[PDB]
Amino acid sequence: SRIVVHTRWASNVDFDRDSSVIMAPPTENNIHLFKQLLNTETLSVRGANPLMFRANVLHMLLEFVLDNLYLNRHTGFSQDHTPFTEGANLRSLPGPDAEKWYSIMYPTRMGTPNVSKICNFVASCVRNRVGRFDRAQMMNGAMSEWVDVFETSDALTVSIRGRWMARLARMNINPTEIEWALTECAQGYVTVTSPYAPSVNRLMPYRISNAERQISQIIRIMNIGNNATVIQPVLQDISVLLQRISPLQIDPTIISNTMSTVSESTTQTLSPASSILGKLRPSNSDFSSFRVALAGWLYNGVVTTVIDDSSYPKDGGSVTSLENLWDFFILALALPMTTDPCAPVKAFMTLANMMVGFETIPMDNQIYTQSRRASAFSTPHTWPRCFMNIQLISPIDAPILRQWAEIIHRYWPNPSQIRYGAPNVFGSANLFTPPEVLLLPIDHQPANVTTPTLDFTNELTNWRARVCELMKNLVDNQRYQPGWTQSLVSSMRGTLDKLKLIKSMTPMYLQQLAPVELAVIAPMLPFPPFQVPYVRLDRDRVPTMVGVTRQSRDAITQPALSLSTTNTTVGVPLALDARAITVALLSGKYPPDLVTNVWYADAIYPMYADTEVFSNLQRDMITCEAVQTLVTLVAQISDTQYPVDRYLDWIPSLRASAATAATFAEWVNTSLKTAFDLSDMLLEPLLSGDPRMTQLAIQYQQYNGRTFDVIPEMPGSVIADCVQLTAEVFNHEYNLFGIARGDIIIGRVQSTHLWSPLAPPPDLVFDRDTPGVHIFGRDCRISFGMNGAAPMIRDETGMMVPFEGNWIFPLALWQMNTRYFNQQFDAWIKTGELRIRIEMGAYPYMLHYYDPRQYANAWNLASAWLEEITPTSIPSVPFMVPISSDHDISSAPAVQYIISTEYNDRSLFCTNSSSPQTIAGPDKHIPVERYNILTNPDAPPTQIQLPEVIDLYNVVTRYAYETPPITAVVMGVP
Amino acid sequence: VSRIVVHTRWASNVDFDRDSSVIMAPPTENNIHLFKQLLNTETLSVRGANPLMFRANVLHMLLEFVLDNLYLNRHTGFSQDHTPFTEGANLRSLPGPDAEKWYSIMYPTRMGTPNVSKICNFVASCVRNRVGRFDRAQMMNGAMSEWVDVFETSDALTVSIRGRWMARLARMNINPTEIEWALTECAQGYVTVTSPYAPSVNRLMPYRISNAERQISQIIRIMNIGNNATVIQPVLQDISVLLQRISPLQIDPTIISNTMSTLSPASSILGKLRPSNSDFSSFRVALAGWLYNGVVTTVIDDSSYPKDGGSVTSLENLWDFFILALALPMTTDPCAPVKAFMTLANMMVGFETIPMDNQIYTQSRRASAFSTPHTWPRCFMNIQLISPIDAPILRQWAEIIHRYWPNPSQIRYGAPNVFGSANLFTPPEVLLLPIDHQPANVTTPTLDFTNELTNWRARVCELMKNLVDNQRYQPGWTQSLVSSMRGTLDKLKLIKSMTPMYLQQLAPVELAVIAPMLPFPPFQVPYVRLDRDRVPTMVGVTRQSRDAITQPALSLSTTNTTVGVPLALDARAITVALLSGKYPPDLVTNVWYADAIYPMYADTEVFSNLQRDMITCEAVQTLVTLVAQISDTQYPVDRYLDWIPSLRASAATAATFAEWVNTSLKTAFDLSDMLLEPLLSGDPRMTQLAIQYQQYNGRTFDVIPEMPGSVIADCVQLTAEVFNHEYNLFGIARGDIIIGRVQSTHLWSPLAPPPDLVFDRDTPGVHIFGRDCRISFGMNGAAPMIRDETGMMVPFEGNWIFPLALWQMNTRYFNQQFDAWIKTGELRIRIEMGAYPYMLHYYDPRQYANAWNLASAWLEEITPTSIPSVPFMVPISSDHDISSAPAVQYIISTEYNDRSLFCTNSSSPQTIAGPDKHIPVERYNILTNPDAPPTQIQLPEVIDLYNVVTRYAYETPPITAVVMGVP
């Protein structure tokens, strides 16, 4: 408000995030914020510090910028009937006293009381370059898509939103075109309801490139950096998603299956059912923790599916044993579920473990012994060479083992991939692979039937075949017999056959039905997952680490050398149990009820009510925009390490420090999060560490040393543009900001003339060129009184001089021993003729009017005002200003104390705007610097003419469109 | 009749003490005690004196008297009385009683002249106008000037002494203004002292000096230390005391406990810490290490090391290397970084493989065993050698070292403007710090990434976890504790200590404030972190004189690690302080430290250091000076009492003397705490010291001191020369003696024998005798006769010549041989003595008992290393004649003299019998001819014993104030 530049004036307000930038009351002091923004070395309802005086100001500017992204929706107009107008349209609004908002928006409705300079200029203006001019109206019954008109405001805001819109609309299309990519995410099988139409000016700004894609990735990649407690719950969220999809029945299923599939060994040394009953659980209740590994699949170079410890027995392995058989079966089943590349070697060593003491062949070291925990082995180098070096396996001592190893060699599941979605609109999916390439630990097979059926065609069914074969090969052993009974082994095979031939709709749904159902979500992932190309063999591909730079090295400002230094943990262990796994594999129980097209798309749509990707896309976009705006500002006033255009340093503000930088960046991040009430990790990982040497990229390397760079890139910040523009323009309007260029001259002067100390008559100032200069830099001590001499200052050479004259002082010396200085100077500047140019550069000030008719003192303990300040900063300058008359007024004294070293008096809200003359009131004339147009039609309104031409009543384009929420146009078909 | 009381220190105007024996030894009493209180150590009785040290002792002798007189003068009131002989005089009123008797003592015309007496008669010639108060200073306190000359009995000796004294003193006074300015700088702007008052010009602040003095003092201090720990350990003690006494920050390991929420890591550390400890000192001492470097080295035990070995699988070793790795970088031992590097390597030896550069070196060898610049490996000096497959872990580690390693700084300190500051390997006001500092207002939470300390915790947590992750560098590790251990690493990396803040910006302040308070200033070394060749190697000094080709004094720099005394610390307490840190819960920096400061600086002791050092340098100055006056050194010397025979010098001579001085002055200042070990830190015949220090490169930096004058030896020359023109005055005479039995009734003293009963040495009737001259005995018991240089056998009589070599070595024989011959017959031998003590024997001219008894005694009491002062039976002059004496002379001086003959007939106004002596009215010439001023030219001529003597009302205040600390 007055001087009204602040928002909430007449516009179509829609919602705020507290970008509160405003003014302060002008008839008195004026700070508008800075007893609330930054008071680092000052403290008051009336203070600010010049040792952080560049952050605060920018910050103030930036929030201002933020305040102005609101939705323009112009509604209706009408020709007018004042004598004042000759057809200029009024904007018709239902608002109360729209008339005042017009007499305000336009100088209209301003009558003919008596001859006033105002009224005179009124009678002279134009009847045309006023009100409506033009618009983009090609439709019927609905407003122009935008309307231009001559109304009062600052066209930055106009151009501001021009660039705002530019950033927005750039991503629109004919909508239904996106029904493609949705159907591609619908897999073509989640049928879709939506209208049929091309672009109808309903902006759908979600056509996005891979730049911001990858950038947001990076951000997540350290946002996820070292926090995996959070990954578990949402993984369960996915598990329940699947629960809402999977038809399985668990407890009595396996109950009947097991009571049917085992063979009789009750009087035959540990009956298998009894043992296995006591092992599994009759724990009949909700059990759904199976979906775990399935959902975890979404990450491989990200997470490491490891198996729980107790899943393995703790006996070093042996032959004559039944629980060995149980558990070895279980693991042979579950290991092909793991992501760990040593899992082959792991099971290898595992069978070696139960092969402790009977079959014994080449052993490499004291760890590759068959007595060592397989899971403990970690590195390619931790893998028994012989495992990968099959010829060390003599088929003589380990015939069965060589057998089985070769089985695994030729027989082992393999990876595949699948597609989803569209970079066409939405950029990459992962960055260490081509777009939408979704590699798979499995090799999906095409399902055809819409209902479950029995069949044994599956790589894992084949594996089960292999393992039952090996088991029968072994249990019948002649070393078993002495440890056992013989009809026992008969019943053993009697079990294993029904085992390998047990009922299970699992593997078919897995190999065929699961994969598409995985693809069902499956960008609809709050965190977009990541994965890395697969590895089945050939240790040389075993990755090393994903090093991420977001800065440089200590002594090396280059990224390409700090690469080894700026690098972060990779992979996490996540231990799982095989029980429910085998439970499911050996028993799939699916009713013929999931009518895929019907069932699944049915299960989905109601869930589809608030599609997050919308929030995700905007999230990431604004994210990267912020990040860019940052990487720019850190190089400006606020240098980082590379001197490029700093602008305001003619303002003295203290130099760069990460501490100061971190402070400012906090203010930023704050404002940012507000901008849409953002609430998640945001640049929080960047001030985590120094965002001063910022250099972004990432890489991963493998056992073959093969390195793989990914280097991000950002297209800039529309904000940063506008803000720099305005910043430059500012340099000449500083007056409008309660901060002044120059210094002040201080000594008790006594005048009655009506003159601003903001522009005092020439006679009153002095300089170095002035004689009487007592020049002081940074050597000034002070003696108290002497024998006959008063307190005398030790001089810059070291001499003692009394306190009066023309003296010069650079501020820092002052801020040093302020207290000393102040306790001394009281009289001899107040009463004495001590006058110093204390030299500040650029500084806050403040004011109060006053009636000149009485005497005026500009002491009023302005000293007291001073001493209130710290030895660390300076108090804003209050001023008493007379009410000068346009003509006669009587004489009264005025004892001033402080004056501006310059003329800078330019700031005023209107006072006495109705008269060609007034007795003594604020001498004010219509500010004729913005409406010269109203006397002559010129000044290309939209052409860039600032600061060369700055007005406040301009080209005005209130918009009007069709603004549907995109969550709403999400109509599903079940 | 009596003689003159040549004295001082008999009318003390003060209670100050010197303990400097200004007694003169009387003649009715004994005399040679003053000649048996010198460097002589072989004396045993009332009587006797060594010939060979005669000259050699006089120095100290005359010196001590001087040491009596630097006392301080004060006001005296105003007396106004007049009597006929005292008409119109402003006598100096004295608060003391019988001061009028003391006036007659100082006022001659005080007494009158009503009759006949050498007093009455000559005082009848004395005026009343050159008596009493002469002239005054307009500068004056009470009833006396700050300098007021007044006619009075006095010795110009004391005058000159205190005059040059005063000169020095006032040459030092300091303005309270610049004083408080100092105190400000001393307080670094954290004192508050003003002074609006009524001025007083008596006030005295004489303490302004240069730097060379303190620098010398620091040198000698180190020398006396001679590398003794017990010297400076208690220094560190006082330090830690005041430190723990002053720091508001609080430590609480129990915090972590809750942070951990009480092996499992927690159990391990809980056993590691003993949750009972209550004492907090040696850590503070680890800090105070940063204050002195040039002599000491912070080191660490290896009981903290994993046997200085370690492995890659011992969880305890994890704890310990963790612990240390944190507690290290703050040390001063320069081999630290590569040492921790190599220790880490040793524990790791076997998984990662790196080239070496010495077979005796071992990648598993002891870091302790590697403690030289030569223990540096060029692979640690070039990482590019480390292929990232050799040991990438260690490569990254070495780079971490190259990068985050601590980095020194400095600050201003001291008040060199007036008192100066002593620093040689650095400018005086420069104060290093092995780390870097930052500005104030830490009243914000203590979190700081940019803190090299948080930096440290961060980087170490990283490298640790990074390594621990693989499970394979650590085989045998089965249960997944990547959860427990690594989350623990997180929690600890997330433990907040306010200590690092104190360290980063507060400790700098504390120590900068301590700096001026040092009764012993620092001694440190230019800190570096790299370039072994730059690494210092030598801290040498030359306890030997420089004027000859002279290697410096042996230094331990080649046997210690670099230069410094070892110092092993506790990693536990240190790293805990690094770990748990909390400031007072309501703290406001300044007011806290204001109150913490006040009473401390309310006390002050550095002025003791000043007095110490100034006296020290003056003392050694005049010391080596007098050395240049005693005998021959490696430079031309000038002796002056060589007219008093004594040989050239040995060392223990001055040694005795040196400690004479040390004792004397310590007793003279009641600062009996020892100051100097002159040769006990120096060398019998040295002239100068000089320091030097060099790096491993061979870059040497070699400093030499400078000398100012010392008026002491000057005034010594002053005094002696006057005595060396006015002799006898104190018990020693030049000349010789003639020995033989002559008798007379014409009365005189053997000091004034007529030159008739005398003969020149080697007179006609000559009888020369060398060392080898042996006797021809008489025949059948006849008179033996002695062989001549020609051979002739002459009897025991004539004029005989013994310069001296043999009588020294053949005393008692000679006595027994020549006794009766001198006793009853002529045997006139001249014996050569040069300068020598004498004695008297009071006797009446009317009676006699044999002096030859006591004479023979004095003979018996001589050794070649000892001579007693010769007694002489002294008669009574009279105002009336009496029965003369046949007096039997045996031995007599060879000369006429006056030592102190004042005046005959102590109170008898006239004298007839015996000699006469009037008053040396000579000395009071202004009292005879007042044409003369007091600075008239009469020196080194006759001394006057009456003067106008400036007396003073200046005042020295004990240096204090009323102030406040950090506001």
Author numbering:
A (entry chain A): 302 to 1275
B (entry chain B): 301 to 562, 571 to 1275
What do the study's own words say?
The particles harbour 10-separate genome segments and comprise two principle protein layers, the innermost composed of 120 copies of protein λ1 clamped together by 150 copies of σ2 (viral polymerases, λ3, are attached inside adjacent to the icosahedral fivefold axes). Here we demonstrate that vitrification of infected cells followed by cryo-focussed ion beam (cryo-FIB) milling and cryo-electron tomography (cryo-ET) allows high resolution reconstruction of assembly intermediates of a mammalian reovirus, allowing atomic models to be constructed which throw light on some of these fundamental questions.
For stars, analysis focused on the fivefold regions using emClarity16 yielded a reconstruction at 6.6 Å. Broad features of the organisation of the molecules parallel the arrangement seen in the virus—five copies of λ1 (termed A molecules) cluster around each fivefold axis and five further copies of λ1 (termed B), orientated in a similar fashion to the A molecules, are located 35 Å further from the fivefold. Since the 60 copies each of the A and B molecules account for the large majority of the density for these particles we henceforth term them single-layered particles (SLPs). The maximum diameter of the SLPs is very similar to the corresponding layer of virion-like particles, however whilst the latter are roughly spherical the SLP is collapsed inwards at the icosahedral fivefolds by 100 Å, to give the characteristic star shaped cross-section.
